[PDB]
Amino acid sequence: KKHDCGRAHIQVCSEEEFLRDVMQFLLIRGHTRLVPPGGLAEFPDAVLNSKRLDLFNLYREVVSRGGFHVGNGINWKGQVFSKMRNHTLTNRMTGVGNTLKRHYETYLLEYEYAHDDVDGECCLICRSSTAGDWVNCGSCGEWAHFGCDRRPGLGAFKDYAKTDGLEYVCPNCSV
């Protein structure tokens, strides 16, 4: 079920250590066509918005939100793509969410299942993992259900979730 590898935990793992572990995993799973000759410098052979696909930040942004299964509960264009080297301020990458999901399926989904990098934190308010809308506190980095924050004056959830949306600070951090 799990890769042995002994790769560093995802909070402190370097990009090079991560990518070398992805290459080794893809080879042991028999997906030889995904690992070109020329080693790490040539991996992956995929381009997004005219730059080589940035698998490290794609992976970090998805597993920090609960993994690929969260699906369209992740804002791929607005919160995943924006953290990748492939992002540019002005771009016409209108199908980028679909593209990123396809690349994640190709390079990273089996890898995700074979590692222990997915965030499964509970709500800082109610202490459960109930399904629903969540926001990450910009101050402490913990996660809260939007519905568990009953303070007046909060925006609509969609205004937190849209690209470069509202700042969220949880009730425990707020001064």
């Binding site: 939100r65 609960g66 919160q79 399904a131 969540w134 926001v135 990450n136 979730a161 949306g165």
Partner: peptide
Amino acid sequence: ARTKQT
């Protein structure tokens, strides 16, 4: 903010 919908 960083968000997710589960």
